[PDB]
Amino acid sequence: MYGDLGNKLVLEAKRTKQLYARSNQDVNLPMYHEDIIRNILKEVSNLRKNTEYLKEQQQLGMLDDKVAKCQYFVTLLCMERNKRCLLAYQRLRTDILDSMAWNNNGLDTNNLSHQEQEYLKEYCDLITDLKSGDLVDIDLSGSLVPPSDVFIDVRVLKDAGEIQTEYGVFNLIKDSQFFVRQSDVERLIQQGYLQKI
Amino acid sequence: DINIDDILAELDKEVSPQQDFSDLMKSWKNERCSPELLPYPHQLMKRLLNRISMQSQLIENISMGFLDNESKLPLLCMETELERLKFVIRSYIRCRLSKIDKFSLYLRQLNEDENSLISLTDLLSKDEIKYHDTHSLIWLKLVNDSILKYMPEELQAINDTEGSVNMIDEPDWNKFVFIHVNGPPDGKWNEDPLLQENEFGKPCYTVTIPDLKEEVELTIGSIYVMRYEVIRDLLRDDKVALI
Amino acid sequence: GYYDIDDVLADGTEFPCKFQYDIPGLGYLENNPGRPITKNTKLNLPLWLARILAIVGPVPFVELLPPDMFSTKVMNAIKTDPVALDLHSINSHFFSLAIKWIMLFSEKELANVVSELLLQRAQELNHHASSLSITNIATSTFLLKLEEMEKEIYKKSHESYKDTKRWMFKK
Amino acid sequence: FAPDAVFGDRVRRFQEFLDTFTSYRDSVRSIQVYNSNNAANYNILPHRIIISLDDLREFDRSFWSGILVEPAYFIPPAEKALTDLADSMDDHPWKLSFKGSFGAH
Amino acid sequence: NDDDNTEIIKSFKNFILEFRLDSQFIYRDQLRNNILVKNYSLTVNMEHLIGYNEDIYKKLSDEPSDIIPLFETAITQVAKRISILSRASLPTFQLILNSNANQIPLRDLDSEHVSKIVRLSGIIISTSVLSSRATYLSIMCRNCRHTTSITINNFNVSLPRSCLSNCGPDPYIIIHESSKFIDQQFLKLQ
Amino acid sequence: SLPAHLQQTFSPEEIQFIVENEPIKIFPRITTRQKIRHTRWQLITTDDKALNNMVAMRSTEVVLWIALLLKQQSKCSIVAPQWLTTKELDRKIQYEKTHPDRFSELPWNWLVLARILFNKAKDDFHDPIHELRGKIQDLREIRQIKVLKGLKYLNESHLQLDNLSLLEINELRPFITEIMDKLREIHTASLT
């Protein structure tokens, strides 16, 4: 029956929601269900053909004030349901992509639809437009854990050689350790090169 | 004895950056916990961003003066101050951007509704107006090409209010929130019109839960879990604040 | 919410419907597009459809028969022992569906019973959410009997307690 | 606390319950007239009633939970009240039985 | 004797209420967390008991069959103090022990280990049904109906031989309505 | 743009950040008040005067994050607030035991500030710190009993929690608001 593929798709939605919600990291979101979506869209096209057939046959006039009213209303509701299921799935994966944008890309691509890939590009362009405009003195893409300590120990987890910072350098020797201003290394903690606190 | 405390008061009587930071803290705390998107403090945020810019330039200038008496400790306090302050602004803005994500269609409805007593440019920042417009356009393009291209003309609208389920999500106005009953921002309990005496002669505000047709006395200096709509104007006037 | 996935799922559950008219063409609900639906046909329809056909008609096109999940058997089971009851086995979305049913037919008795159920289970749920490790079998059994609605409230509550305990004891 | 001091109140509360849910009075009288007819007509129904435990809850939750959690102090007064009801019907101790919604029990 | 038992009980109450590592009162927290989910027991690590006050562990290991009941009693008192408001009921809490002492293999256990705390390992080959043991007997005399009660701790008990003030030769019977019982299970370890 | 767990509550770290903005009394171990016979603090979130005019062991009041930053070094000692002493905590415990319905009027920051100062200023307490930790623990346990009693009376209408801490509130918030919301939704659904 016409609601079923929508239910399969939103059960998929719920499972990917749980997959994302169980962990602190961004779990790489699962494959876009192109096949179920195409089955739904074909089902919607069939329901559209049924409305077309019926609105043709209202010229022929069979009991239309009730019977055609009922057939039309039911198939219309089937289409509303299928729209709701499709938009619920797409809105969840949109929400997760927005989260990933702010977490990393605004500072696994095969699993997205091409609309979702170019959407993620445009949304990263938007985040960068915000932190590049007014309010620029705040790195709007930065962390939301409050700054507890200004100086921190950090252990170098992967090697990256000599890099400059605002008034000096760090030579990121493997398994060396710094005592350093947190604001001068936060980018490297996010990028996974530095370990502690 | 003859009381003289007023005589002594009339003899004794003979903006600030700290208040701005306190107002920012109040705005952040109220924003985080409320269901509604609260109106943006335009002037306060202009002043705060100016101070962050100037204080950063100051810390730069002193660092150059060190590079080109020499106690580092006040510079450390200045640096971690700007880090803490920038965190508050970051958390505040990111929070209300999330609210704009939730209520993008409702905010569009407030923009479209010519009869509205709220204009979107009262409620949102310039940057939030930009974000709302272009995020709405980009998400709408995504779902148009992906999904709504294939629906009939009955159903291509993304803000359908008449369907079997309403597409426009709005704030849960009667959502429960914790509040602390400040009383008026001045100490002048005599000047507040809504303030009144409770039993035992302690001040309060009475508010009516409209669904239940029940009055409740929000006594000053005590904490309540309340429907947000029921307290909304007391919150607008700072008579209560969200914990 | 329109995009609230647990609401989209709850709307997908099915309720017993009795049709009030002979209507051609709707036989695909009875798995054959080529035949009518007849008056006093008794059929299970999803709630997203049954909600609408029970109001449009005049007599509406459908009457909704009392579902088993709100039968006198289940209501009596609720009213004896709220915390021991396996609501998940009754229906995984019982609270959302009860809210929808109360709204669809204004029913003070069910509103009271479901409120009593929610409150009395909220006590036990908070006990298991508050207790933290330093999973316990007594907790592990209780979380089976929770709805998806209650599982969400439990995860959020328990995560709050766990986060607070973490902050208090780890430097 | 001693059980005897509360026995009378428990008796009259179960009597009020039986008076309220009069299907139990009808059942007692139906059993009695069946047995009288079959005794005279020359096979016998027992002096036993199944009470819906839900009815006793909806009447008085305190007495209901008394039957569940402390039956040694709550079934004897209930059976005394039932026996007195059977005595109040026209012309032996009557016993109780239970059905429905035991929950954790 | 009961003065010394009171001092032992107070010592254990202090162990629960005072023992702390890295800012957490692990036994207060564990006791509360157990009470919320309604399991009335406490799991004690004997490393912590030794570390707190080795005199207590010396008392316990000297004669556990007398000292374990007193520790359980101490746990009940703390349980009430941290979960029931003082002046506005719980069963006797089971004491569970975790240990890392050197194991004795099953075949080496013999007369020198009688009444000692013992640690061992094996495979459970059988598990019997849950028999019922009394924790608390309500008691009365068959003739004069003198009424009393006997609290029981399951570490090695009887009824009294004659009445506590003629009542006949063997006078006491149990009252099962006000007596209290617990599950007991037998396991066979190979 | 806001994480799922920060959507409608504060993290415990954010609660600490809020509490860190409170003033606290310190004994300086540096002198910054210049004699009549060099860098100044030049803050913008809080008052600059006290830090610019410190003298060693003349006690003075500064915002707590600065007091902790100084106490990270030997350059300060943080004076405990008056409530955080053995006799005062014992008075609050007796109040809590004496009044089962009310919460005692400990300041809203009490658990957070106790945690902060026991970890970062363990040597500044006049009282032995093990007793202060014990009595803070007594208070949290008793107040938690009262919390459980209070949750038996959740409503579709409102609730009152006079002297509950910021941290205790924040710990309970994603439960109480959810349950009262769902009771409201059940109740309002019944209305014609």
Ligand SMILES: [Zn+2]
């Ligand atoms: Zn005797």
